[PDB]
Amino acid sequence: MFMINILSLIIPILLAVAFLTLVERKVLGYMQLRKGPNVVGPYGLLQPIADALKLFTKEPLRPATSSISMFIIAPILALSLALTMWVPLPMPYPLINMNLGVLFMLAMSSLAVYSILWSGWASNSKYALIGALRAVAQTISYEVTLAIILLSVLLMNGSYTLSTLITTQEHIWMIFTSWPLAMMWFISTLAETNRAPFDLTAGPFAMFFMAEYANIIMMNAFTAILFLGASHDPHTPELYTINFVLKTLALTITFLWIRASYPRFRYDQLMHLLWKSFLPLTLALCMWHISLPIMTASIPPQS
Amino acid sequence: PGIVELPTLEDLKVQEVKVSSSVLKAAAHHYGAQCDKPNKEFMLCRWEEKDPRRCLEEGKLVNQCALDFFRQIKRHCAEPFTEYWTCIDYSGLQLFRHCRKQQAKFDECVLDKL
Amino acid sequence: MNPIIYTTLIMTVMSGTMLVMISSHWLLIWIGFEMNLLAMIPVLMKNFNPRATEAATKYFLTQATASMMLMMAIIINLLYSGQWTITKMFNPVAMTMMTMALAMKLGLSPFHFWVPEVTQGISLQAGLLLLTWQKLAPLSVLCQISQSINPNLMLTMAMLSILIGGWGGLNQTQLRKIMAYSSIAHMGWMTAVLPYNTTMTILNLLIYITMTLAMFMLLIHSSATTTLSLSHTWNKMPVITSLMMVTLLSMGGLPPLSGFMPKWMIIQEMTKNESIIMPTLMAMTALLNLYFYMRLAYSSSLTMFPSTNNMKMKWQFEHTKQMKLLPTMIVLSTLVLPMTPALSSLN
Amino acid sequence: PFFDVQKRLGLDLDRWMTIQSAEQPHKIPGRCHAFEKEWIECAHGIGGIRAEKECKIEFDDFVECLLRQKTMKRLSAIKRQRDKLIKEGKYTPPPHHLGKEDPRP
Amino acid sequence: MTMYIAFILSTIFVIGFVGFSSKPSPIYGGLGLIVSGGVGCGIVLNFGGSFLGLMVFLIYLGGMLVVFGYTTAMATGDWVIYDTGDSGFFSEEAMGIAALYSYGTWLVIVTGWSLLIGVVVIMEITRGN
Amino acid sequence: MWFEILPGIAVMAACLFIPGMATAHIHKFTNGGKEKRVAHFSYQWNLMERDRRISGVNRYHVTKGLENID
Amino acid sequence: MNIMLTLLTNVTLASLLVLIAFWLPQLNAYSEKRLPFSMKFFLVAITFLLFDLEIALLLPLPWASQTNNLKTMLTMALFLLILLAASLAYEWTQKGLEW
Amino acid sequence: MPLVYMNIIMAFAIALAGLLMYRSHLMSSLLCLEGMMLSLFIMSTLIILNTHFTLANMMPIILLVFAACEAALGLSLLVMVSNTYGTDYVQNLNLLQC
Amino acid sequence: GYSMFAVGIGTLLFGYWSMMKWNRERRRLQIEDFEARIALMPLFQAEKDRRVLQMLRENLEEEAIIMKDVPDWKVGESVFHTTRWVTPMMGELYGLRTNEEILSATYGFIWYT
Amino acid sequence: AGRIASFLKNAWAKEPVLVASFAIGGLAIILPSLSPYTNYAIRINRATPYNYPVPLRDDGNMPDVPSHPQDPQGPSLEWLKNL
Ligand SMILES: CCCCCCCCCCCCCCCCC[C@@H](O)O[C@H](CO[C@H](O)CCCCCCCCCCCCCCC)COP(=O)(O)OCC[N+](C)(C)C
Ligand SMILES: CCCCCCCC/C=C\CCCCCCCC(=O)O[C@H](COC(=O)CCCCCCC/C=C/CCCCCCCC)COP(=O)(O)OCCN
Ligand SMILES: CCCCCCCC/C=C\CCCCCCCC(=O)O[C@H](COC(=O)CCCCCCC/C=C/CCCCCCCC)COP(=O)(O)OCCN
């Protein structure tokens, strides 16, 4: 029943982002001394459905001179990549057990910028194209440091297999072994998804929104698996699933908290942040985490 | 140039070890401790001849020795062994480290029996 | 640019060539060519102007295409024999692709079109480096695999190069295009003897490099890039024009000058292989090179052209920078014919 | 041209990566290790011309191992004759080649 | 037999190369090259080259064609030749690639020097003036 | 108060429980009540192939115990 | 097969949802009525390209750590990271990271 | 020699021919070079993986790296040429003539 | 200021020690798994040789039955000059078998996730 | 002495990230050559059996080569158990 497995992996993610919209709106409402939506539905529970119905029946403003090809393609690529990133995730058993799971996710993330580039280029506006170029530059800039931090952390694991991350953290979380890399990784995940304080930018807009929120949840789930390792009992994986979901929810709520707490950067300020604070520390800590298992004779097994 | 020589189908018949990979993994350590000599003779013949057709008798010997090993286990330590390989069969990686207790039971059983 | 950066780039060009000449693995030879290409571009673009940028772009395009063809030939040869060592080609298709790539790197016809373009675009120092040092690596690779080359294709390209250089130099008033076409003709002379004797190829390369170094240094000293500009040199420094005229006589292969040594030897070598017609056509075609060298010699030292009034001011000043190796280059490119048998040193 | 600095200094800058039968990591053999080993041992010191003329048996076996042209020709001939006979109706494949055999470990 | 899936992949690769080799509207040529690169990564991955296929698909597609499109935006028979044995408890491709640090010292030295020189050359070329 | 947020969060929790849990159960159903066998490295693949061959029903997970050794 | 089926399913679901989104509001009738070329962003893209290449060089590190030649691989990995840092420093001091 | 290798070589030849027509858009020339290196990578990887030559698993990576560096240089050159004319048209580089 | 850095360094050191212990244990467990595989290997090698030879024999018998009337055909003629044993390809063993097991033997490991 | 301390103190102000990065990189370069456990890592790597131990054909002239895995002679892994 592989089709059933695919559908039961994909539909719940879309429902989760649908209600993530509500959870974010209500959490920021209560952090702003007010309440979020609590009218449409018993506790706002019907708000995402109302928003979806309103958006799906509204006139689609095709630019009437743009390239229809790229205009259609960009949301397709966005959703396809956002849903594909969830394939190799081991909670605890992955849908598609791969040897180079981390590498596959890195490659998909690298593809993710084509949607931004095509949406900007097919918008038929100079200002929108400038904004798209700025966003693409920020994204590639921060994916450099994501890649380096990721390989440095995986040096403690022995491979690119995502399931082994459960075994690596059977006694202690990876947060304690390397918290500085975790801090820079968290900030880089914030800057990748164009989230505050790095947010400097009817139907297709809804698909773009769904892709972005799916990416947010996916990044937080990957962070939880990578740095906050839940203990997995082979004879009852429900405990691991519960722990993983709880940690993912905590990290997503932390993104909402950060968006509610801080002002935003300038473009040159976040470029300077990356290239002159995160890259040097990332390189130094990469050297440190290369040398540490050799110094301490604690190299992980798999080769 | 030339005709390749192959042994006949009757020449390749042997009493086959029909136990699964979990049973084999559960038995592997004692199997290697007990059946070392025929296995080593076969592997030495195999890297020295560089030819499968020159090593058939040694393979039949290793099959017979494995059958004898499993027959002794069946006569003496059937139930602890069944529990241990049920362990090994459950796990998807077939890890040894998850149920050391049944392994200990099987080890003490074979130590006291054989 | 920063002199330290310029020194680093020059040493990287030289290290790429040396990596090509010391390695036995095709991948390392390709890497040496890549390193040389990478460090060559800023040297050509040192004096920033649109002409130099255009020349650097043309050079990069041609050399990158040649590198891609070289890698293609390497991969085909690996497919038909799991070999990475530079020795035999092991395939007729891999040898043809390899010869094409090395001919494009050298500027042999029919891949000669970029040489006059790039040489005219860049300055005199960049042209000196381009026409002297950049021939060492492809020619070394060709010398290593010469027993594999199809003599028909190599001889066809060599004869084409000689013909094209001779005919294209006849139409030039720019000195840099004259140098480029001379380089093309000399490449043709060098590659026509590879199937028979690589020692003669190396001897021809050494003689050509000496003459080209002397010629470019004389052109830089009397800072002229045009025939009429060179016609003014006698009124300031006639000895430079006299040395230039003797160097041009040597470049034309006239005995008893040094430039007669390669062609002679090459002809000699080719007659040992019952090859008579091709050397004859080669010499008769080199007569064209001699003709346009004589035209330049007429314009430079054998006759005195009109000057300008402002030249008097230039009479009061001396060169601030002088070239240490120019006299040695002139003497070596003019007067080494008596020392010919020293070629047994396998230079 | 070629300046054999590695041979003069005994360095081995790139000789480790030239042939299949030369010290792979974890002693992993090439697919044609034996054929290449035989061809190299045949032609050592003999020189290019004599190796070309006299070691042709080993090189031909090496190329056959590398590209397997002759084996593919033979397999295609056998399968083409099989198809002709099964279309004409005088041959029937056994249950072994139809999926009804008894697989062995 | 999936009608020689390798043959279909190779033919699609050639068709994509023909499509973008006409060079209409260089963004469309780049998109044809993206599809061709995806097909080539599929060929390598289906062959069994997981790491090298992912290297192509990451480096080539996600960096190099991305930079190409960014710059443009500023302006205007099978199944037979294979093996029989296994690879042990590791993958031979990963071992051979990881040997770059123990076996390929010379390769690492020359490649690193070339990359540093490439950075320097890029700065010098784009300095302008 | 703040607990008014909890319902919506709970919904997400359920939506995030479904994939993982589902996979586990499916792995227990298509693999005979056990974990799905992992096969990297090409040796575990050979193990599964041998198990499938000796099973007799062309399923690897059907495990042949010592009762099959005669 | 399974990965191909998963990719096909994701693409198909995305396309189908996009098409229903783009065609449902098109059944009812409605009204139905430059040059500058900044150079800094090009340098950002090129710097990303070069550092991404050096990342590609660094990727086999998890497997490089089981070689029995730990001194050699440690030296070479540290060499690669040092030259990465040196590229960053050179681009920094030549005013290549400025806005 | 299988058909897959011939298909890849014919893709390389098509990319080279495209680089040779030069309709316009030196940008397209760089695209043709990049297609050529993609075909080179694919075919070298297939040959090396087929014969189990473990060490040459290095060289595709190497090739990749070097080619991309070249591309970067090429792109830089393109910009400067465009920086002179405002467009990357091939026919604009007619100042120097044989 | 000093206290924050002290806490960070201390938690780093605790994590380092814990990971040292756990990874040494993982190395020992991996060695034990490898030991078991080594112990089992000779039987697998014997079965491999027997199966390959049996499949080759079936192919040879079917070739003899098929090519009985081909004039110049020799049954079971080697393509190599050398008499040394050569490992057969995938297509030599499964050439005459059905398509599904050809796909299995070619792509089962690659396509298994 | 005074100048170097002044320079380091001036860098620790307004440039703490660079100071930390350079310190960590230098420690990564230096410490492995001084740690006593790097040789232990080398030994652990050499003790991992990836390949089948091919037996030697005995000739009566190898006292140090065991006939059985249980025999005392041959490399031991007690040190690894101790770690
Ligand atoms: C003798 C000539 C020196 C002066 C001329 C220099 C010419 C150019 C500079 C580059 C040459 C440097 C020599 C290094 C050659 C590499 C091979 C040699 O060093 O042996 C290596 C030894 O490795 C050493 O660690 C070398 C480390 C030195 C590299 C770090 C600095 C390199 C900088 C050199 C110039 C690069 C650009 C400038 C940088 C500032 C191989 O390791 P080994 O384990 O035995 O064998 C592996 C095979 N196994 C697996 C079967 C065992
Ligand atoms: C004994 C052996 C030990 C080896 C040595 C290790 C010691 C480590 C010591 C240093 C580690 C610290 C590194 C952490 C990252 C520091 C980077 C940094 O400081 O950059 C800041 C920038 O930092 C930021 O501004 C980021 C703010 C972005 C907003 C995010 C809100 C922060 C709160 C969110 C919670 C973070 C959660 C982290 C954990 C996540 C877990 C996944 C500098 O910028 P400026 O102050 O403006 O000065 C620059 C001009 N000269
Ligand atoms: C030897 C080990 C090397 C490997 C480890 C390092 C890995 C990564 C670190 C290197 C990355 C590249 C660094 C590039 C340096 C740039 C310096 C610079 O010019 O920037 C200065 C900023 O900082 C400086 O002043 C220059 C460097 C000052 C010294 C920095 C630290 C030097 C060494 C300190 C530690 C020494 C050893 C460790 C001891 C620590 C104490 C225990 C100017 O700032 P702007 O951004 O240009 O703004 C202009 C307007 N104000």
Side-chain angles (χ1 to χ4, degrees), chain C residues 89-129:
Chain C
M89 218 47 215
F90 297 110
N91 196 54
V93 204
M95 187 61 229
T96 303
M97 197 120 239
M98 175 74 62
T99 308
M100 295 298 102
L102 288 169
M104 185 180 288
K105 280 189 175 302
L106 273 172
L108 285 166
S109 294
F111 310 102
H112 71 279
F113 288 94
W114 63 267
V115 186
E117 295 294 328
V118 175
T119 316
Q120 181 61 36
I122 64 191
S123 63
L124 278 175
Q125 289 86 352
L128 176 148
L129 194 80

Side-chain angles (χ1 to χ4, degrees), chain H residues 48-67:
Chain H
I48 293 167
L49 287 178
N50 178 62
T51 63
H52 299 273
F53 182 76
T54 304
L55 283 178
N57 301 343
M58 293 180 184
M59 62 79 70
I61 297 174
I62 301 284
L63 166 71
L64 184 70
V65 169
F66 265 86

Side-chain angles (χ1 to χ4, degrees), chain A residues 175 180 182-184 186-187 197-198 223 258 262 265 272-273 277-278 281 288, chain I residues 9 12, chain J residues 14 17 24:
Chain A
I175 192 66
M183 290 162 66
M184 284 192 281
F186 206 61
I187 303 315
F198 312 93
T223 299
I258 286 172
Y262 297 117
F265 283 95
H272 175 281
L273 171 68
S277 301
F278 276 11
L281 280 173
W288 175 254
Chain I
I9 296 303
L12 280 181
Chain J
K14 65 179 73 175
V17 176
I24 293 171

Side-chain angles (χ1 to χ4, degrees), chain A residues 138-294:
Chain A
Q138 160 183 347
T139 314
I140 61 182
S141 291
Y142 274 87
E143 79 187 31
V144 175
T145 198
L146 288 175
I148 302 185
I149 286 166
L150 197 45
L151 70 88
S152 306
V153 167
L154 284 188
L155 274 163
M156 213 58 258
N157 184 42
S159 65
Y160 294 98
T161 310
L162 282 151
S163 304
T164 318
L165 285 169
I166 301 174
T167 302
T168 307
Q169 297 165 109
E170 184 178 1
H171 296 68
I172 192 170
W173 289 353
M174 201 96 72
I175 192 66
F176 302 128
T177 313
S178 70
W179 53 268
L181 286 174
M183 290 162 66
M184 284 192 281
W185 165 275
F186 206 61
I187 303 315
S188 298
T189 54
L190 268 167
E192 265 286 293
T193 48
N194 197 0
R195 288 284 295 171
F198 312 93
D199 49 347
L200 282 71
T201 64
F205 166 68
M207 283 74 75
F208 272 114
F209 196 85
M210 263 186 309
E212 293 179 354
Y213 268 57
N215 280 316
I216 290 167
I217 300 191
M218 191 276 300
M219 295 299 291
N220 284 300
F222 190 34
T223 299
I225 287 164
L226 193 65
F227 287 112
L228 317 170
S231 293
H232 162 59
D233 184 74
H235 283 95
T236 175
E238 303 100 21
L239 304 186
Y240 182 96
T241 314
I242 291 166
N243 290 318
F244 157 82
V245 166
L246 288 193
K247 298 194 184 85
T248 298
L249 286 190
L251 282 180
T252 317
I253 291 173
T254 310
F255 284 173
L256 317 179
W257 190 7
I258 286 172
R259 183 178 182 270
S261 295
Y262 297 117
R264 69 160 66 73
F265 283 95
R266 297 198 307 238
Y267 197 84
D268 72 286
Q269 299 196 304
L270 61 87
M271 294 299 291
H272 175 281
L273 171 68
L274 176 84
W275 289 99
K276 301 188 176 184
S277 301
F278 276 11
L279 203 47
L281 280 173
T282 310
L283 299 184
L285 284 168
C286 192
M287 300 188 218
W288 175 254
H289 276 89
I290 288 180
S291 289
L292 180 74
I294 307 185

Side-chain angles (χ1 to χ4, degrees), chain C residues 51-62:
Chain C
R51 299 292 179 90
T53 302
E54 183 178 1
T57 305
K58 293 182 184 293
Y59 188 68
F60 167 88
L61 271 170
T62 47

Side-chain angles (χ1 to χ4, degrees), chain C residues 210 324-333:
Chain C
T210 307
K324 277 74 69 177
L325 286 175
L326 182 50
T328 302
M329 284 312 120
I330 277 157
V331 165
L332 286 187
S333 67

